[PDB]
């Protein structure tokens, strides 16, 4: 689910970037490993909002490394999944174990035990898909899936999807 | 054709006045429908109000009641149909005039461009080198220098 | 006591939304063109197209809810100041439009080539019926005319370099 | 010709002779063309010249506030057909009269007529109000769009654009002089 | 501040409104005060991120159908965002495909229409995201709506939003 | 003519410098001039308020040099009222400015010599 | 660049192929549906100013 949250990150600047315009190297270095970065505590961070003023306070030199430690506080748009939430998406890959649906920036896998029994795998189709009496689940197909279990590591988030509930499935 | 600065500013001012009248009529229509909305809801209609209007008149001051359902007569049906036919015919004539004028402009422009391209062919050999350049418009510049020779 | 049951619920706030979008887009046109320098023509064309789409949405909403809107007449309330502000309300419920639009409408009426003042009404009915038949013939002519037509690697660089530095022949 | 809704009707001659109060709105509206000359109101008016259910509380306040209207409706319940009652009043000058047919009892309302400043108005329905506003809006944007199109000029070397109608070191000099 | 382990807590469930201790309704901003949790629907998220991107494009310069919009936001991403934009590009194409409302006027008036509900920000964001057609469908899709909104109010809100969605 | 009398009696209470003692009270103004350098013409509204900028003509030969009329008007009107005596400060600042662009022209000749 | 010209020409062709036809087509009189003068006015402005 999409949110706007105030976040703080500890950033280490190499001493080579101690130039007259250190703040812009620090802001760019804030950009490349926060934009699109995945953190399990706050979800997939999408974009750093309000770039013109970002809280960059006085940075501490590490006593043995020599790099400067800045705790940059910023406001960014995130996407944190939860269990029991309903998100729409498109299928990007399919297999006999199940299919993976892309929701926002994140891929959610829907297992073979979490489709209704009318849906079955058909590997003979090109591309391979899940076929039922009333609908098909192919690649690049809109599908509504509820997330019922998600696991988040320190840098990776994975979720389990299911479409067995009514008013779910393909859109 | 040729068009002047005073003609340009006159056209700008008259389209500005026409669009002023447009937004005036649309804004009174919106403000009326929100005034009538505020009688029954009072929540969403108050957002689109004018501060001067709220200063001079309080909301929930209008009311509506149901007159019975009426079947419209065939006389105004054929009146609306004949007016529809007239509006369609006038729009078709306006479209014809617009397309004819735009064709005349496009034909003159295409004649100039084709003359330019024929001059380019009868002018430039493949031995010569040409590249695009900006001022910011596209211009073809030929390099006649000896620095690469 | 006062009651507000003769007022439509979803037609009226839906058209309030659509007309509010129209007014907001007109204001965007205004502060886009009020400057002495015009914006570049694609943005203003996009604004014109989205305003036209907004107005066709307005009339689609209003015409889809044609009836139950002809059936609700508006009258003011005693809370409205009708003595010091009746000039406010007389140009608030007015359906007599500006003289330009209906003089152009009457100009359009006489340029249709057929009128009512000297023709009997069933002649107008059959003329409109045959005009509708001509529209049907023209659109099926367009339909059949539209449907008539349709609408690398020669070797291995690493193996060659391994030959030139070691002497091993490139195995094929 | 102007139809019945886009006209404001008043008789200031009748105001000079009789005057308009909360009692004589009935005959003042009878002088207006909105009144039905075949209505039940005028036949019972000619006959008389020669608590209570099936009513809303808005008219009930009028009936319990003014007597002549309550014997008016007491004569009106005997007959059937189109009638004229005053649903709401605001002294010194505000009235409304509704067309209304009564059957036995069952009552439906019809077109109202609000009175402001001793001037009789036909209460319009809002569809033609917003339709007239959209006539004005659509005609105005039509005029803007036609008046704009003549300034538009297309070239093949560039994009489509508008018709074109037919020192820089001094700041550095200022900042260096101080 | 106490040093308790406090390792026992309920699992983050959107049905039970539990989104974690870092997703409560009141959020402390960087200026100090508690402020309401910001949950964006998909159209709202697309408009906010597009506004941020055009703001960054304007800062860099100073220092509608889906087909013509996808190329525009793609070239905006290329001229605005640098590396590691794969997640952002996936998000932008996702928000383009799943766009209930196009312009800012629709989104903002949807926000002020949902503010008359007075419900949780998460569930009204889901309502602005999910295109439910019937009240019981929204109830079974969003379990937070159970014993939270009247059925007739939910029905009129959903059919209103159906009228509000364009293209 | 009464404004000419006004600006003529305004400089009665003003001491006049030797480089700017050449002045011409005419055309509703007083023409403070330095030969071959500049001529500045000034006027006031009444007695108790200071003068204001009207125009300035350069008397050196390059004329018709472009001037940024309102920034120069802005700081001239700034240094008029804020100074203890306006005419000497105006003369010093204007002399500095005219010698500044004279040096810029000399540097332009030097760079065009190469 | 050269791939974009393909779909650019394709989309211009596929809207030119149907736009004049639908311009003629929507001028249909019936009692889509134009039950008021508003639909007539908006159609007769949208054809000229949109097609």
3-class secondary structure for D62-127?
A: HHHHCHHHHHHHHHHCCCCEEEEEEEEECCCCEEEEEEEEEECCEEEEEEEEEEECCEEECCCEHH
Residues A8 and A29 in one domain: yes
Query: What is the distance in angstroms between the Cα of G17 and the nearest Cα belonging to chain D?
Result: 23
Q: Give the chain B residue whose CA is nearest to the CA of G45.
A: B91
Q: How many CA atoms lie within 13 A of C62 on its CB side?
A: 29
Contact of D173 with chain F, judged by CB distance below 8 Å, is answered with yes
Q: Kindly state whether B44 is in contact with chain E, defined as any CB-CB distance less than 8 angstroms.
A: yes
Cβ neighbors of D31 (< 8 A, separation 6 or more) are D11, D14
Instruction: Using the structure block, give the residue that is written with the tokens 């920034």.
Output: F71
CA B139 vs. chain centroid, Å, equals 31
Cβ atoms of residues D24 and D66 within 8 Å: no
The SS3 of residue D152 is strand
> What residue ranges in E46-157 does DSSP mark as E strands?
none
Residue D8 bridge partners (DSSP): D121
- Token look-up 């404004």 returns F3
Beta pairing partners, A13:
A68
How far apart CA G13 and CA F65 sit, in angstroms, is: 58
* Tokens describing residue B132: 């695009």
d(CA E138, CA E144): 10
Last residue of a domain, one of A56, A82, A108: A82
CA distance A78 to A5: 7
User: Given G29, G36, G48, which is nearest B91 (Cβ)?
Assistant: G48
3-state SS, residue B143: coil
CB hemisphere CA count around C134 (13 angstroms) = 7
Rounded alpha-carbon distances, angstroms, from residue D51 to D56, D158, F19:
12, 82, 106
Please indicate if any CB of chain B lies within 8 Å of the CB of G32: no
Encode burial over A144-170: b for 16+ CB neighbours within 10 A, e otherwise. Answer: bbbbbebebeeeebebbbbbebebbbb
Radius of gyration of chain G (CA): 16
Sign of CA dihedral B129, B133, B138, B144: negative
Distance between CA atoms of residues C65 and F100, nearest Å: 76
Rounded to an integer, what distance in angstroms lies between the CA atom of residue A116 and that of residue A114? 7
Say whether A3 and E97 touch across the interface (CB within 8 A): no
C-alpha–C-alpha distance, residues D51 and G9, integer Å: 79
| D99: β partners | D84
Token code pair at residue F61: 């030969």
CA distances to B83, C111, C113 from C107, in Å: 10, 6, 11
Q: Among candidates F63, B81, F15, E129, which has minimal Cα distance to A171?
A: E129
Contact between E131 and E67 (Cβ < 8 Å): no
CA distances from F48 to F6, F13, F16, F45 (A): 11, 11, 18, 9
C neighbour chains, 3+ CB pairs within 8 Å: B, D, E, G
Length of chain B: 149
Q: Pick the residue of C9, C10, C17, C22 with the most E CBs within 10 A to test the interface with E by mutation.
A: C17
Determine the 3-state secondary structure of C62 from DSSP.
helix
Out of D56, D117, D132, the one facing C95 most closely (by C-beta) is: D132
Neighbour count for residue E21 (Cβ, 10 Å): 9
Beta-carbon pairs below 8 A across chains C and G: 48
- D147, B26: Cβ pair inside 8 Å? no
Which residue numbers in chain D precede an interruption (C–N > 2.5 Å)? Answer: 50, 104, 166
Q: Do chains G and B touch (3 or more CB pairs under 8 A)?
A: yes
Q: What kind and span of H or E run contains E149? A: none
**Residue written as token pair 């036919």:** B85
Calpha distance A95→A111 (Å, rounded): 10
Contacting residues of C for D141, CB less than 8 Å apart: 51, 55
Query: How long is chain G?
Result: 51
> In whole angstroms, what is the distance from residue E142 CA to residue E130 CA?
9
Question: Phi and psi (nearest 5°) for C24?
Answer: -65, -40
Whether chain D has a CB inside 8 Å of the CB on F102: the answer is no
E116·B47 Cβ contact <8 A: no
- Measured in angstroms, the CA of G35 and the nearest CA of chain B are apart by 8
How far is E37 from A78, CA to CA, in rounded Å? 13
Q: Same domain for A70 and A98?
A: no
Q: Provide the b/e sequence for C75-92 (b: ≥16 CB within 10 Å).
A: bbbebbbbeeebeebeeb
C88 token code pair:
């406010």
F71 vs D contacts (CB less than 8 Å): 170-171, 174
Instruction: Write down the H helix ranges in C34-152.
Output: 41-64, 86-90, 99-110, 121-148
Other Cβ atoms closer than 10 A to D148: 21
- Determine phi and psi for A127, rounding to 5 degrees: -75, 160
Q: Do chains D and C touch (3 or more CB pairs under 8 A)?
A: yes
Smallest Cα distance from D145 to chain B, Å? 8
D and A touch with 3+ CB pairs <8 Å, answer no
A2–E90 CB contact, under 8 Å: no
Are both A28 and A98 inside the same structural domain?
no
Please give the full DSSP string across E19-60, using - where no structure is assigned. Answer: --TTS-SEEE-TTSSEEE-EE--HHHHHHHHHHHHHHHHHHH
Cβ neighbours of C142 in G, within 8 Å:
20-21, 24-25
Is some CB atom of chain C closer than 8 A to the CB atom of D129? yes
Distance CA(A157)–CA(A82), nearest Å, equals 11
Q: Long-range CB contacts (< 8 A, 24+ apart) of C118-127? A: C121/B74, C121/B75, C121/B78, C124/B78, C124/B81, C124/B82, C125/B78
- Write out the two tokens for A125: 């189709």
- β-pair partners for A130: A121, A137
- Report the C-alpha gap between E5 and A49 in whole angstroms: 34
CB atoms closer than 10 angstroms to residue C163: 14
- How many angstroms away from the CA of C150 is the closest CA of chain D? 29
Q: Do D5 and C95 touch (CB under 8 A)?
A: yes
B94 phi and psi angles, rounded to 5 deg: -65, -40
Query: C-alpha angle A96/A97/A102, rounded to 5°?
Result: 105
Check whether residue A159 and residue A119 sit in a common domain.
Answer: yes
CA–CA separation, A75 and A55 (whole Å): 9
Distance in Å, alpha carbon of D131 to nearest chain G alpha carbon: 6
For chain E, give every domain's residue range: 1-39, 40-63+65-167
Counting other chains too, the contacts that A50-53 makes at CB distance below 8 Å and 24 or more residues apart are A50/A74, A50/A75, A50/E52, A51/A27, A51/E52, A51/E55, A51/E56, A51/E59, A52/E55, A52/E59
Rounded Cα gap, residues A89 and A101, in angstroms: 6
H or E segment to which residue C76 belongs: strand C72-76
Torsion over CA of A15, A17, A20 and A21, rounded to 10 degrees? -140
Is B15 within 8 Å of D147 (Cβ atoms)? yes
Cα–Cα distance between F63 and F51 in angstroms, integer? 26
Of D149, D173, D152, the closest CA to residue D164 belongs to D152
CB neighbours of residue C159 within 10 Å: 14
In angstroms, the separation between the Cα of residue E91 and the nearest Cα of chain A is: 5
Residue of chain E whose Cα is closest to the Cα of B42? E116
Chains touching B (3+ CB pairs < 8 Å): C, D, E, G
Are A72 and A94 in a shared domain?
Answer: no
Q: How many whole angstroms separate alpha carbon C95 and alpha carbon D130? A: 8
Question: Rounded to an integer, what distance in angstroms lies between the CA atom of residue D108 and that of residue E60?
Answer: 67
C-alpha distance across the termini of chain F, in Å: 54
C-beta separation of A71 from E130 below 8 A? no
Q: Which residues are CB-neighbours of D150 under 8 A, at least 6 positions away?
A: B3, B11, D163
A10/A70 same-domain check: yes
DSSP B73: P
Q: Looking at the structure, do residues A18 and A102 belong to the same domain, yes or no?
A: no
What residue has token string 């093949």?
D156
Resolution of the entry in angstroms = 3.6
Taking CB atoms and an 8 Å limit, are C57 and E105 in contact across chains?
A: no
Q: Are residues A165 and E140, on separate chains, in Cβ contact within 8 Å?
A: yes
F-chain residues within 8 Å CB-CB of D174? 68, 71-72, 75
Last residue of a domain, one of A82, A111, A127: A82
Q: Give the SS3 label for residue E150.
A: coil
What CA dihedral angle connects A73, A77, A82 and A85, to 10 degrees?
Answer: 160
In angstroms, the CA A73 to CA E50 distance is 22
CB contact under 8 A, B18 and D144: yes
Token pair listed for B69: 């359902």
Contact, D34 vs D11, CB < 8 A? Answer: no
Would an 8 Å CB–CB cutoff place G16 in contact with chain B? Answer: no
* Nearest CA-CA distance, residue C50 and chain E, Å: 7
**Domain assignment of residue A97, given as a range:** 83-171
Residue of E106, E160, E166 lying closest to C14 (CB–CB): E160
DSSP per-residue string spanning chain A: -EEEEEEEEEEEEPGGG-STTHHHHHHHHHHHTTTT-EETTTEEEEEEE--SS-B--PPEEPTTT--EEEEEEEEEEEE---BTEEEEEEEEEE-SSEEEEEETTEEEEEEGGGS-TT-EEETTSSS-EEE-SS-EE-TT-EEEEEEEEEEE-SS-EEEEEE--STT-EE-
Tally Cβ neighbours within 10 Å of residue A95: 13
With CB atoms and an 8 Å threshold, state whether F100 touches D177.
yes
Check residue C171 and give left, alpha or beta (phi > 0: left; psi -120 to 50: alpha): beta
Q: How many CB atoms lie within 10 A of CB G16?
A: 11
Picking from C9, C11, C16, C18 by the largest number of E CB atoms within 10 A of its own CB, the best residue to mutate is C18
Chain D residues interacting with chain G (CB cutoff of 8 angstroms): 127, 131, 134-135, 138-139, 141-142, 145
Chain D positions touching C96 (Cβ under 8 A) are 2, 6, 132
Give CA–CA dist B44/E115, Å, rounded. Answer: 9
Pair A77, A109 in one domain: no
Contacts of B36 in chain C (CB under 8 A): 7, 12, 74
Nearest to C101 among D61, D123, D139 (CB): D139
Contact yes or no for E160 and C50 at CB 8 A: no
- Count Cβ–Cβ pairs < 8 Å, chain C vs chain D: 107
- Is B89 close to C113, i.e. CB distance below 8 A? yes
Q: List the one residue out of E120, E150, E155 whose CA is nearest residue E18.
A: E120
Cα C159 from Cα C49, distance rounded (Å) = 62
- Nearest Cβ partner for C76 among D58, D114, D137: D114
In 3D space, the residue among F37, B16, E27 whose CA is nearest the CA of residue C26 turns out to be B16
Statement to judge: residues A74 and A87 lie in one domain: no
Q: Is B95 on the interface with G (CB under 8 A)?
A: yes
Task: Compute the distance between CA of residue C24 and CA of residue C61 in angstroms, rounded to an integer.
Answer: 18
| Distance from C-alpha of F23 to C-alpha of F15, rounded to nearest angstrom | 13
Residues 113-142 of chain A with CB under 8 A from chain E are 142
Q: Which fold has domain E40-63+65-167?
A: Growth Hormone; Chain: A; (1.20.1250)
CA C63 – CA B89 distance, rounded (Å): 22
Q: φ, ψ for residue B99 (rounded to 5)?
A: -70, -40
Chain B interface includes D163 (CB < 8 A): yes
Q: Which two tokens stand for residue A14?
A: 């190499």
C59 has a chain G CB within 8 A of its CB: yes
Quote the CA–CA distance of E106 and C21 in Å, as a whole number: 7
Rounded to whole angstroms, the Cα distance separating A79 from A44 reads: 5
Please tell me the distance from the alpha carbon of residue F52 to that of residue F36, in angstroms, as a whole number.
Answer: 23
DSSP H or E run through F91: helix F86-113
Instruction: Determine the Cα–Cα distance for residues F27 and E47; give it in Å rounded to an integer.
Output: 63
Query: What are the residues facing F80 on neighbouring strands?
Result: none
E159–C10: do the CB atoms touch at under 8 Å?
yes
Tally of domains within chain A:
2
DSSP bridge pairs for A60: A69
Query: What is the distance, to the nearest Å, from the Cα of residue B12 to the centroid of all Cα atoms in its chain?
Result: 13
Query: Using CA atoms, how far apart are residues E50 and E101, in angstroms rounded to an integer?
Result: 14
- Cα gap E150→E127, rounded to integer Å: 15
CA-CA distance, D88 to C3, in Å (whole number)?
11
Task: Say if residue A36 is in the same domain as residue A54.
Answer: yes
Q: Do A49 and A108 share a domain, yes or no?
A: no
Q: Beta strands A157-162 and A106-111: pairing type?
A: parallel
Tokens linked to F30: 């007083």
> Are the Cβ atoms of G49 and D145 closer than 8 angstroms?
yes
Which stretches within F11-85 are classed as H helix?
A: 69-82
Cα–Cα distance for residue pair F40/F52, rounded to 1 Å: 11
- CA gap E43, E50 in Å, rounded: 10
Q: Which two tokens stand for residue D139?
A: 């005609």
């Amino acid at each position: 689910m999409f949110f706007i949250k105030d976040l703080s990150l500890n950033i280490t600047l190499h001493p080579s970037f101690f130039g007259p315009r250190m703040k812009q190297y620090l802001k760019t270095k804030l950009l490349e490993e926060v934009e699109g970065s995945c953190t399990g505590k706050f979800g997939y961070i999408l974009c750093v909002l309000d770039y013109d003023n970002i809280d960059i306070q006085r940075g501490r030199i590490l006593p043995t490394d020599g790099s400067a430690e800045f705790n940059v506080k910023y406001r960014a748009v995130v996407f944190k999944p939860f269990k029991g939430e309903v998100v729409d998406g498109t299928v990007v890959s399919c297999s006999q174990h199940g299919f993976e649906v892309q929701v926002g920036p994140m891929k959610v896998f829907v297992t073979k035990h979490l489709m209704p029994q009318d849906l079955t795998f058909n590997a003979g189709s090109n591309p391979p898909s899940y076929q039922s009496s009333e609908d098909v689940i192919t690649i690049k197909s809109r599908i509504r899936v509820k997330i019922e279990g998600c696991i988040s590591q320190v840098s990776s988030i994975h979720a389990i999807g299911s479409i067995k509930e009514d008013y779910l499935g393909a859109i | 054709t040729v068009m002047t600065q005073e003609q340009f500013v006159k056209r700008r001012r008259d389209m500005l006045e026409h669009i002023n009248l447009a937004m005036n009529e649309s804004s009174l229509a919106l403000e009326f429908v929100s005034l009538l909305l505020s009688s029954v809801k009072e929540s969403t209609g108050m957002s689109s109000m004018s501060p001067f209007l709220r200063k001079v008149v309080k909301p929930s001051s209008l009311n509506s009641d149901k007159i019975p359902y009426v079947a419209p007569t065939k006389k105004e049906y054929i009146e609306l149909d004949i007016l529809n036919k007239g509006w369609k015919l006038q729009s078709l004539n306006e479209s014809k005039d617009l397309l004819r004028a735009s064709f005349n402009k496009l034909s003159s422009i295409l004649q100039n461009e084709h003359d330019y391209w024929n001059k380019i062919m009868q002018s430039i050999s493949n031995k010569d080198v040409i590249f695009k350049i900006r001022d910011g418009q596209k211009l073809l510049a030929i390099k006649y220098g000896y620095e690469d020779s | 006591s006062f009651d507000f049951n003769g007022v439509p619920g979803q037609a009226l706030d839906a058209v309030r939304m659509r007309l509010a979008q129209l007014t907001h887009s007109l204001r965007r046109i205004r502060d886009e063109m009020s400057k002495a320098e015009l914006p570049q023509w694609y943005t203003l064309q996009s604004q014109l197209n989205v305003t036209l789409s907004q107005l066709v949405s307005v009339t689609s909403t209003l015409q889809h809810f044609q009836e139950t809107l002809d059936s609700t007449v508006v009258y003011p309330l005693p809370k409205f100041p009708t003595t010091s502000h009746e000039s406010l309300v007389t140009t608030l419920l007015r359906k007599k439009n500006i003289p330009e639009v209906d003089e152009w409408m009457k100009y359009v009426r006489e340029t249709s080539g057929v009128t009512t003042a000297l023709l009997k009404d069933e002649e107008i009915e059959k003329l409109l019926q045959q005009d509708r038949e001509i529209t049907n013939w023209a659109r099926t002519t367009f339909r059949n005319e539209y449907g008539k037509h349709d609408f690398s690697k020669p070797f291995n660089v690493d193996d060659v370099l391994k030959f030139t530095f070691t002497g091993e022949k490139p195995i094929i | 010709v102007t139809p019945l809704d886009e006209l404001q009707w008043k008789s200031p001659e009748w105001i000079q002779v009789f005057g308009l109060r909360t009692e004589n709105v009935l005959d003042y509206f009878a002088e207006s063309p909105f009144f039905d000359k075949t209505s039940n109101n005028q036949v019972i008016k000619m006959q008389r010249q020669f608590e209570f259910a099936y009513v809303d509380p808005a008219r009930r306040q009028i009936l319990f506030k003014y007597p002549m209207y309550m014997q008016l409706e007491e004569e009106l319940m005997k007959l059937d057909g189109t009638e004229y009652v005053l649903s709401s009043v605001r002294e010194p000058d505000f009235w409304v009269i509704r067309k209304q047919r009564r059957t036995n009892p069952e009552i439906i309302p019809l077109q109202d007529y609000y009175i402001i400043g001793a001037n009789i108005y036909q209460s319009p329905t809002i569809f033609k109000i917003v339709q007239s506003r959209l006539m004005s809006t659509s005609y105005h944007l039509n005029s803007t769009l036609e008046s704009l199109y003549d300034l538009i000029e297309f070239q093949p070397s560039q994009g489509v654009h508008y018709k074109v109608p037919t020192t820089e070191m001094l700041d550095k000099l200022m900042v260096t002089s101080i | 501040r106490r040093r308790r382990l406090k390792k026992v807590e309920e699992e983050e469930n959107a049905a039970t409104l539990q989104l974690g201790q870092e997703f409560q309704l009141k959020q402390i901003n960087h200026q100090g005060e508690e402020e309401e949790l910001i949950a964006l629907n998909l159209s709202e998220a697309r408009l906010v991120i597009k506004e941020a991107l055009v703001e960054r494009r304007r800062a860099f310069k100073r220092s509608e159908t889906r087909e013509k919009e996808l190329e525009s936001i793609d070239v905006l991403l290329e001229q605005t965002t640098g590396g590691n934009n794969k997640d952002l590009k996936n998000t932008m194409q996702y928000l383009t495909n799943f766009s209930r409302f196009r312009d800012q006027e629709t989104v903002g008036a949807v926000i002020q229409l949902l503010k008359s509900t007075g419900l949780h920000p998460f569930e009204v964001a889901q309502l602005g995201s999910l295109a439910c057609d019937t009240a019981d469908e929204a109830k079974t899709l969003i379990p937070s709506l159970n014993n939270k909104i009247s059925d007739d109010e939910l029905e009129r809100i959903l059919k209103e939003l159906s009228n509000l969605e364009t293209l | 003519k009464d404004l000419n009398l006004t600006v003529s009696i305004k400089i009665a209470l003003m001491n006049i410098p030797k480089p700017l003692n050449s002045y011409h009270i005419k055309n509703g103004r007083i023409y403070f001039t330095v030969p071959n350098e500049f001529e500045i013409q000034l006027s006031t509204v009444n007695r108790q308020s200071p003068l204001f900028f009207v125009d300035l003509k350069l008397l050196f030969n390059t004329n018709n040099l472009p001037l940024n009329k309102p920034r120069l008007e802005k700081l001239i009107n700034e240094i008029l009222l804020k100074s203890n005596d306006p005419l000497l400060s105006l003369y010093n600042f204007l002399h500095k400015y005219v010698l500044t662009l004279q040096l810029y022209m000399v540097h332009r000749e030097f760079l065009k010599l190469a | 660049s050269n791939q974009a010209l393909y779909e650019k020409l394709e989309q211009t062709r596929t809207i030119l192929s149907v736009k004049l036809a639908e311009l003629i087509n929507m001028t249909t009189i019936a009692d889509a549906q134009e039950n008021s003068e508003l639909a007539v006015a908006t159609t007769s402005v949208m054809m000229v100013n949109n097609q």
